[PDB]
């Protein structure tokens, strides 16, 4: 029985963490690329996670299946299309989906990811093919989807390029820029490539989210807000370790993109402690609930709502309040945001 059988808004989910295992198998076979299993079940057992690992152990799953997907025009469009299909099944009326265009390319990307042979699919092609699948998906399945392009903490040399892509494909599907990767890298938030990309974002009306405070380091959250000028924080559980910063961000109405089930499996949240989202709820903070990587976490949006309802005593009206906040904090042009908001109001009546 679904925890929240009403319209939801999702703001934090990775496209490459939300591929169908049967679709991976299909393209592995078609392209003659090796995979450690030949069935959905076995592939799920390998890439899926039943128990907490860690940041690196989570990220390690991508190497199994990304060679099958990256560099194939047909595959890139299809996962985007199928992303919409499966999200539509989760009672989501509006999704923002994020990815690194560089990680799906096999051309004009230095260094080359996934041990790929140099081909002809550029980062620009990737964004184009994803736009195509998300746009076709939106028409076919009746829900609204927009994209977010990701900078990588360890590759600031790609960030200005991520900004250029955001600018070229503004509103045709891209609404924002993200920053992913290892937040424990000393001063990665300050690398000139990220700093200037995020400065250029402000200048160009490209919206801004940043992964920070997922595993620790409240200072990285402060860096995201004060230096990169982010509008939402991805995760941000460890912001509560600096009470003065958490207090300020509460007053400034900062949005926290919360991924409860993810935080457990990545080991970001120690299960013996109470989840940060409990403080967010009690403080009436601005936050959303999100799947993050449903493939690795074997989850749907209901996983994360079930979790909060059962273990953390979340109510119908808290689920309603946070989805309204997620809408208000969405990266839509004002008029589309009003529409989304008005739809939520009537269905929560
Ligand atoms: Ca962290
Ligand atoms: Zn086999
Ligand atoms: Zn087998
Ligand atoms: Zn090309
Ligand atoms: Zn994430």
UniProtKB/Swiss-Prot annotation:
Tissues in which the UniProt entry reports expression: Detected in brain neurons in the median emninence (at protein level). Expressed in secondary deciduum (at protein level). Found in all tissues, occurs in large amounts in T-lymphocytes and, at the time of weaning, in gastrointestinal tissues.
Cofactor: binding details: Binds 1 zinc ion per subunit.
Reaction catalysed by this enzyme: adenosine + H2O + H(+) = inosine + NH4(+); 2'-deoxyadenosine + H2O + H(+) = 2'-deoxyinosine + NH4(+); cordycepin + H2O + H(+) = 3'-deoxyinosine + NH4(+)
A GO biological process held by the record: response to purine-containing compound
Result, substituting residue 235 to A: Increases affinity for adenosine 20-fold. Reduces enzyme activity 500-fold
Entry similarity comment: Belongs to the metallo-dependent hydrolases superfamily. Adenosine and AMP deaminases family.
HAMAP family xref list: A_deaminase (MF_00540)
Designated name of the protein: Adenosine deaminase
Organism (species): Mus musculus
